[PDB]
C-alpha cells in the first residue's frame, strides 16, 4: 500500500526470513513489486496473516507482471535529422539508418556502414549511445525494444555546428521511429515446464496445460510416473502449483525454465494497450 | 437449450416429443433437453 | 455495400408493390437459385448481410451472382422533426423485389452446399423465399 | 506376483529399452527386457529399421513369449521408390513408382501374413496401398 507500509514489510521479512528459512523474498530487479516465495498456497497464505497482523502491514495481493519486449516485423529506413541553425552554435546532426528485425533472441547489432566518412569519426560513438539509448521504452508499452540489427549507412554533418550531442539525438530519432514504422509486435516470455505425473492423472493434466495458451512437446517417462514437457506464457502460468496438485491430488510436481520470447496473439496486442 | 421458440434436433439421439400439447425434445445429453415456449 | 455510381435524381417517389416480377424470374446463370415469394424493399445491407454468410458458409466455393441491384433511394426525414419542409434525405438504398424474382443464384457447388447457404440467406432476408433448380428455365430470352 | 497377459505391444526395430509401454505391462511379465534386443535384432539385423509388431504373452511362473509379424506394408514400398513419406495427397502427385514385378516381389515378403495364398491377390493388396500413399505402379 502507501509507501508507509512498504517499510513495516521490510522488517516483516527481516525477521520473518530468519524465523523461517523455507522461503525467499525477492524484489523484482526491474520494477519495485516484491515476490513472496512459498511452497504451497497455505504457506504463503498463513504468512499473509502474520505478516498482515503481527506486523499490521496491509497491502495488495495480485500477481506478478511479465517481462515483455518490443520489436518489429518489417525492416525500415528513416532519416535522422536534427539541425537547428539560427545563429552561432548551429547544432547540426543528421544520419540515416537501416533497421531490420532479427530472430527472437538475436540481440543488438549495429552497422558502421559509413564509406569514406561522410559522418565524421568523432561522432559515431555518440550516435550509438543515442540509438542504444532510445531502444529503452518501447513504442507499444515502453519495454526493451530488442532483437534487432541496426545499419548506419548514411548521414552528413556541419563543420562547426555539429555536436557530439546533436548526433546522439538524431540517431535517437531514427531509432525512435523506425520501430513505430516497421509495425511493432509485443514479444513475451515462454517457459519450459516439466510436470511429473502418474499417467493416471496425466489425461487431464495435459488438457489443462493446453488450455493454458501452451503447446505440448513430449513425454518420456520417469520413475513409475511420466513427465510432460512444453512451453507456456508466464502470464497464463501463474499459481500453477495449486492447479497441478489439483489434477493430481498431490502426486504432481513441475519445474519451469525460461527459454525464449515470442509474439502475442494480436487479440492480446490491443489487450495490453493501457 | 431449455425454453425457446425454435426447438429442433440437436443430434439424432434427440427425439421430438409432444406431451401435453407442448412440443418437447429429449436426448441422452441433458443439454439437448428442450421444450417450446 | 453496393449502389449507383451516378444518378439523374437524388430523390425518387415511393410507388407501390404489385404482383408479378416483370422479369428475371428464371435461372440463366447458375445451377441453383433463390427466389422471392413476398414482395418488399430489401436494403443494401440485407443483401450484403446475406451475400456474406452466403459465401461464408462455403469457404472456397463457386461464384454467386447478385441478380438484384438496388437503385432506389431510401428516404427518411431527420428525427424529431415535423411534416412539411420539403422531402427527406437519403439514408440508404433498396432494390424493389417482387414475387417470382431471382435474387441470387449460385453456380458451381455441391447441392448440399447450395441448398444450405440459401437456407441461411433466407434468414437474413425479411421475406420468405424458394430455392429453385434449373429444369424448365430453358429459353427465357 | 502380478497377473497374466496377452500383451499386444508395438515395438520398433532396435530400440529395445524397458521403457514403456514395455514397463507397466511387462513388469507383470518378468520380461527379459534384454533378451529381445538380441533375439530380435539378430533376425532384424537384416532389416535394420521398420517397426515390428509383437504380442508378448506371460504365464504362471513369471515367463514370457512373443510372436512378431512383418514390417508394415507401407514400408517396403517407401524404399522401393526412393520415398520416406507417402505423397501427402494420394492420387494427384506421383513421387515415384513400382513396376508390375516390384509389386510381385513384395507381396512375396508379406504373403504369409495377409490371407490370400496367391500373388494375383496379394499383389493387389500391395497395389491398393500404392494409391494409399500416392505411388503409381509401373505397368
Amino acid at each position: 500500500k502507501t509507501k508507509a507500509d512498504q517499510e513495516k514489510l521490510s522488517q516483516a521479512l527481516a525477521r520473518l526470513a530468519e524465523e523461517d528459512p523455507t522461503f525467499r523474498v525477492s524484489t523484482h530487479p526491474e520494477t519495485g513489486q516484491t515476490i513472496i516465495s512459498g511452497m504451497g498456497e497455505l504457506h504463503l497464505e498463513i504468512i499473509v496473516d502474520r505478516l498482515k497482523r503481527e506486523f499490521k502491514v496491509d497491502a495488495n495481493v495480485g500477481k506478478p507482471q511479465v517481462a515483455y519486449r518490443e520489436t518489429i516485423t518489417k525492416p525500415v529506413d528513416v532519416e535522422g535529422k536534427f539541425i537547428r541553425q539560427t545563429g552561432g552554435r548551429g547544432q547540426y546532426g543528421h544520419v540515416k539508418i537501416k533497421v531490420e528485425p532479427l530472430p527472437r533472441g538475436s540481440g543488438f547489432e549495429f552497422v558502421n556502414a559509413i564509406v569514406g566518412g561522410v559522418i565524421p569519426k568523432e561522432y559515431i560513438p555518440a550516435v550509438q549511445k543515442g540509438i542504444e539509448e532510445a531502444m529503452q521504452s518501447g513504442p507499444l508499452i515502453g519495454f526493451p525494444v530488442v532483437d534487432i540489427k541496426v545499419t548506419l549507412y548514411d548521414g552528413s554533418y556541419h563543420e562547426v555546428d555539429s555536436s557530439e550531442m546533436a548526433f546522439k539525438i538524431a540517431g535517437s530519432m531514427a531509432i525512435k521511429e523506425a520501430v513505430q514504422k516497421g509495425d511493432p509486435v509485443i514479444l513475451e516470455p515462454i517457459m519450459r515446464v516439466e510436470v511429473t505425473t502418474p499417467e493416471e492423472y496425466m489425461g487431464d493434466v495435459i488438457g489443462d496445460l493446453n488450455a493454458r495458451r501452451g503447446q505440448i512437446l513430449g513425454m518420456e517417462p520417469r520413475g513409475n510416473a511420466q513427465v510432460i514437457r512444453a512451453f507456456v506464457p508466464l502470464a497464463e502460468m501463474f499459481g500453477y502449483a495449486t492447479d497441478l496438485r489439483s489434477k493430481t491430488q498431490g502426486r504432481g510436481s513441475f519445474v519451469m525454465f525460461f527459454d525464449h520470447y515470442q509474439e502475442v496473439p494480436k487479440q492480446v496486442q490491443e489487450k495490453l494497450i493501457k | 437449450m431449455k425454453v425457446r421458440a425454435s426447438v429442433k434436433r440437436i443430434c439424432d439421439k434427440c427425439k421430438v416429443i409432444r406431451r401435453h400439447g407442448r412440443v418437447y425434445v429429449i436426448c441422452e445429453n441433458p443439454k439437448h433437453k428442450q421444450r417450446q415456449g | 455495400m453496393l449502389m449507383p455510381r451516378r444518378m439523374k435524381y437524388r430523390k425518387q417517389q415511393r410507388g407501390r408493390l404489385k404482383g408479378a416480377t416483370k422479369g428475371g424470374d428464371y435461372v440463366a446463370f447458375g445451377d441453383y437459385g433463390l427466389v422471392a415469394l413476398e414482395p418488399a424493399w430489401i436494403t443494401a445491407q440485407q443483401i450484403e448481410a446475406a451475400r456474406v454468410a452466403m459465401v461464408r458458409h462455403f469457404r472456397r466455393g463457386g461464384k454467386i451472382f447478385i441478380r438484384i441491384f438496388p437503385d432506389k433511394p431510401y428516404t427518411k426525414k431527420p428525427l424529431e422533426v415535423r411534416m412539411g419542409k420539403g422531402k427527406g434525405n437519403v439514408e440508404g438504398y433498396v432494390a424493389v423485389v417482387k414475387p417470382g424474382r431471382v435474387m441470387f443464384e449460385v453456380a458451381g457447388v455441391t447441392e448440399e452446399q447450395a441448398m444450405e447457404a440459401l437456407r441461411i440467406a433466407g434468414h437474413k432476408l425479411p421475406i420468405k423465399t424458394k430455392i429453385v433448380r434449373r429444369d424448365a428455365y430453358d429459353e427465357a430470352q | 506376483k502380478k497377473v497374466v497377459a496377452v500383451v499386444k505391444l508395438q515395438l520398433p526395430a532396435g530400440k529395445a529399452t524397458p521403457a514403456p509401454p514395455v514397463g507397466p505391462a511387462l513388469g507383470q511379465h518378468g520380461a527379459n527386457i534384454m533378451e529381445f534386443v538380441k533375439a530380435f535384432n539378430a533376425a532384424t539385423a537384416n532389416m535394420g529399421d521398420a517397426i515390428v509388431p509383437v504380442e508378448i504373452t506371460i504365464y504362471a511362473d513369471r515367463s514370457f513369449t512373443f510372436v512378431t509379424k512383418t514390417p508394415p506394408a507401407s514400408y517396403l514400398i517407401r524404399k522401393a521408390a526412393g520415398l520416406e513419406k507417402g505423397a501427402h495427397k494420394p492420387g494427384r502427385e506421383k513421387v515415384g513408382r513400382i513396376t508390375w514385378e516390384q509389386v510381385l516381389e513384395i507381396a512375396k515378403q508379406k504373403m504369409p501374413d495377409l490371407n490370400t495364398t496367391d500373388l494375383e491377390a496379394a499383389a493387389r493388396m500391395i497395389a491398393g496401398s500404392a494409391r494409399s500413399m500416392g505411388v503409381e505402379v509401373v505397368g
Binding site: - | - | G19, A20, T21, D25, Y26, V55, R56, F58, R59, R60, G61, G62, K63, I64, P99, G100, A107, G108, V132, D135, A136, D138, E139 | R92
Partner: protein
C-alpha cells in the same frame, strides 16, 4: 418420346388449367391447331425430353407428329408452364438448340475456379432426319483466365451452326475464398 395430346375447341383456355390440363398449340408454316396436354405426363416428359429431343404427339386422329417445344411460357408467380408451342418438325431443315457436352476436364480442375456454362445450348440447323445430340466441346488445356468461344466445335455430318460464331461459349472464373479482404 410420346405425349398424349388433344384438340381444344377454344373455350376457356383457363378452364383447362384449372381443369387439370395444360393448354397448348402446335404449328408450322402450314398448319396450326390449338391443343392441350396433361401436366403429369408433360412434366414427366418435358422434365427430360425438353427442347433437344423431339416429342411425337399423338392425337385421337391417328396422327403422331414430331415436334419441339419452341416456347414455354410461364406463370411467373410460382413457375408453372402455362402454355407450350409445339413446332411440328418435318423433313425441311430447321433450327433448334443442341446440347453441349463439355468432354474433358480442364485445368481449373485441380487448380480451381468454376467452369461457366455461359451457353450450354446452341442454335444450329439440320433436317429432322439427323437428330443430333450432345455436341462435344473440347476442353483440357484451359486454366482460370481467358476462355474459348466462336465455333470451335465438332460440327456433325450435316449440322451447320446458325449463331455467329464469336459468342463467348464458356469460360472459367476464380472461386470465392472466405478469407480475403481488400478494403483496407
Amino acid at each position: 418420346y410420346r405425349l398424349k395430346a388433344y384438340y381444344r375447341e377454344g373455350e376457356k383456355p383457363s378452364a383447362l388449367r384449372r381443369a387439370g390440363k395444360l393448354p397448348g398449340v402446335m404449328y408450322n408454316r402450314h398448319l396450326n391447331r390449338k391443343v392441350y396436354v396433361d401436366l403429369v405426363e408433360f412434366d414427366k416428359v418435358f422434365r427430360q425430353a425438353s427442347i433437344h429431343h423431339v416429342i411425337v404427339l399423338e392425337l385421337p386422329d391417328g396422327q403422331s407428329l414430331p415436334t419441339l417445344v419452341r416456347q414455354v411460357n410461364l406463370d411467373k408467380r410460382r413457375r408453372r408452364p402455362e402454355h407450350v408451342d409445339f413446332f411440328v418438325l418435318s423433313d425441311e431443315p430447321v433450327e433448334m438448340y443442341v446440347p453441349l457436352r463439355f468432354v474433358g476436364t480442364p485445368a481449373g480442375v485441380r487448380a480451381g475456379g468454376v467452369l461457366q456454362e455461359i451457353h450450354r445450348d446452341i442454335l444450329v440447323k439440320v433436317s429432322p432426319r439427323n437428330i443430333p445430340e450432345f455436341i462435344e466441346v473440347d476442353v483440357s488445356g484451359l486454366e482460370i483466365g481467358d476462355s474459348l468461344h466462336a465455333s470451335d466445335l465438332k460440327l456433325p455430318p450435316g449440322v451447320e451452326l446458325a449463331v455467329s460464331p464469336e459468342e463467348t461459349i464458356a469460360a472459367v472464373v476464380p472461386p470465392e475464398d472466405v478469407e480475403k479482404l481488400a478494403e483496407e
